Symmetry: C6
Subunit: 205 residues, 6 copies
């Protein structure tokens, strides 16, 4: 990543073994559950494109997902090149193409040059956005259940049902009441409109 | 978070893999037991709003709770906007709205600008207060037992009973004596008024 | 905590995830065995009152103990206010009350101001003393056995007996010989007065 | 490795116990699965040739692989010497031979001298390229299955089949449709040409 | 401990949670096996007397040993006071007594003052020597077996026997041949005088 | 060890708990498998003689090996004294004897003085060489099998056989073909001379 040193200059630092292991382990344990995306984003804080490829490339499983991700990245790269055509002046900085942002045709030094320029050409942040776009599609693809099929069991605590409901809604990216069981549905219908989730949860507790 | 470097300037630092993992693990292991709140507060020391959302968003379970939390945050944000209406001067700092404090409509750079201003506009601390307000409501909601139902068993050591009593009181946010078993109740009644907890515990040991 | 930076100024630093976890784990594993107190003291090196409350508040169990601790803290705070009555001059430092030392009515900034003043008003150290006073009372309360009941078994190695003896004495805060078994008692009686523990242990080995 | 200090000079640092352990553990757990190579590359960020040999030499198993790697390294070293023949001026820097790049005939001090020269003679990066060339050959050798033999089972979810397919293709370094089972093959044939992987995966979900 | 900062001044640093845990764990796992002493010495590098007491006091078991250690420390302290009698000049440094070196009657500030004086009065190193003296006595006391009773079994590999022999000798603080089994004894007798351990081990392999 | 600080001076640093634990654990898990030596060398990067003794002395088992190591060290020390006889000028640096290099008769301060002199008298590196010489002898002694006895089983994959072969050769410090099983021997004989290991392994795959 690029970080501020103690003196206050923006310097490149090696990606840490702790960061590398954290990402690999979270993918092993959580696959593409929605909460993996904000973990990815936080673990890649200050990442160069090189770092971002490192993180993606260190994943051993899920190669169907990783191939879908490349497709998304290539679509975003092509759209970048459409909006940002490029024409080298000796010792000067060239303008990044899509594949330079994605780290496949740019060097680490070029990446550092862009990201620490004044003003910065934030190739790490641009690439991270494309990756997250791609990961969101994967999360939704691998979401196993429609919210229409999240219905409260006859003996299921309301809390547990609501957990399943909003878990599913998050992965999928009135119905809460309609899908409740008969006893809690009746209680919730008599709360009237504009009840908060807290009030519903209290009511069916 | 925003931290003091070695030289003494307030700089942004990436949230650490250790911090991220600690929060996720404490929620996995403790759910919304009351002691999770001071852990949250300590793990988010110096946090930007971005960091605070990261921590909340990396939680995979408990989505009923996370949705209740958003409701609380939105109520606190709306009350902020009521008390702090906002009117951009080129190169100048805009005033934060509720949704800027909550990190949903403000950039990391804006957040850093506010938090390191002289005097600081402490958007991380303001947001953390709203979050803790929300978490406290959740702790109380998920508190399983009334203090009225914490009663000492016939063979239950007084210490163990008092542990359950104050554990419950903490989650719920004279009765100690009334809920004691017959033998310890008699001992405690004869200590008279103004006995300390230490003296009660000694007496029934 | 407040620490010396690399340059040599006294700066506030966030309490680390490692420190937080170490304290929580030691309480989980050891409860109020006497050795927990020096661990507490070492883990809270340079602690502000805020840090000290964090450590105490992150403990999930033992709420009978934590309530006894508050009582001790309140007694020490009241005695502080008796010896140190307080009368704000714009931009000047106010004098700390007991509840300010205990971190319940003082801000982090006030705490830093006191602890880094020249000379320092060491509110973290003062509060830590009160807490340790309280923890010592708890260790003694939870000490399960009188030293009078630590007696050497007929087949019990002398070393193991002495371990139990001094373990108990430490928790409780001639008898070694009297409580020894008949065979070792006879050996120890013939060593005469002024035998070291080493010599006794050698003698009964 | 060679790193930037806080002041901004390029200094040698000892390889960390964390880095050493991470590499050894990844080889123990993953052997020569393709994802081990980007992990190697990231763990050896800023590595001297000495560091690179350390990492390779700390591997206890897989000595057939490590011997094949030496062969590749020696071929790359010989090709370096063919393109870069060398002729010592007192106190001056000598030009590196292949075996100097590979760290077998150069000292740590010579390596640091080359890597921190202006412009740098990047012996660590040159050697890392040769090593990765060698590791790629090993990954391919140890790839157990031809892509021709990755065929979807009659009850096998399409996702799981695609995972196996691209996993195999990666190790090996239209067919997706041809190797699908009859039911999904029919669905995929009716999508027509130019279907994305996402669309295929959606179609057979 | 007292350490050199980045600038090069001798500063106090808090004892780390990692150091504290390492010591406690090594005592839990190894008790007073001889190798615990060099681990102690290395873990207490730069330690103040306060740090040294912390390490000793965090040990929960082995209180017979810890009491023997105090006896040794008190003997060394008394001998210090015999050789170094002491007579306070306002703002000046007082001379340390034995109990000041042992950290029982000196403050952390006094300890830092002595250890960072020019020339240093190395109270941490002096105390560490007394502690190690004490620990050595304990290692020897808890050594379970005489070297006279380490004899090679009829089927026991010579290597394993030599391991037991020198393990015992280390704890206890020609015979190798005499205690060997008949077959290896005969081989070793025919090597003649001045055989190295390597040659003996080769001979009986 | 001696390290470069952030400013760029060569300073002494305490050996870290992580380093100490890594060495102890690698010896526990791997004993004197050949790969332990490069791990030792990397873990003792920048080590003083004091640090090197610490690492060796913290090993609890393998005392036959540790005694053989001392013998090797004493032979290397005696040869040092033969080549480097020594004659103290007030405030000046004395010349190191063999036992000073081995850290048994020199102080930490003397060691630092030699290692940071201009030019450095690299006593840590000199001692490390002697230790590694000694460790190599031990690796070879504890090598359990002659390369003559590594022969491919009738059903043994060629890869697994080659792994055992080069593993053994490494510990021991044409035959590959001769020791292959009949079927692979025939294949390898028909490749002709100058086949690479890769080509042999491909051929028998
Ligand atoms: O191994 C490290 O270099 C390290 C250490 C460490 O010195 O033990 C610590 C640490 O002080 O405990 C920390 C840490 O602050 O938690 C880190 C870390 O930043 O994660 C590291 C490390 O860089 O790995």
């Amino acid at each position: 990543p690029i970080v501020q040193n103690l003196q206050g200059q923006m310097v490149h630092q090696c990606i840490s073994p702790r960061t590398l292991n954290a990402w690999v382990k979270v993918v092993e344990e959580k696959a593409f559950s929605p909460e993996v995306i904000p973990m990815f984003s936080a673990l890649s804080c200050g990442a160069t494109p090189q770092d971002l490829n490192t993180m993606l490339n260190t994943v051993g499983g899920h190669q169907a997902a990783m191939q879908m991700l490349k497709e998304t990245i290539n679509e975003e790269a092509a759209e970048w090149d459409r909006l940002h055509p490029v024409h080298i002046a000796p010792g000067q900085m060239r303008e990044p193409r899509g594949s330079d942002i994605a780290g496949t045709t740019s060097t680490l030094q070029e990446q550092i040059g862009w990201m620490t320029h004044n003003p910065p050409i934030p190739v790490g942040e641009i690439y991270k956005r494309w990756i997250i776009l791609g990961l969101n599609k994967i999360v939704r693809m691998y979401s196993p259940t429609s919210i229409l099929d999240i219905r409260q069991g006859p003996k299921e605590p309301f809390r547990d049902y609501v957990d399943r409901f909003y878990k599913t809604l998050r992965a999928e990216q009135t119905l809460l009441v309609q899908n409740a069981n008969p006893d809690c549905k009746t209680i919730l219908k008599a709360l009237g409109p504009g009840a908060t989730l807290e009030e519903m949860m209290t009511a069916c507790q």
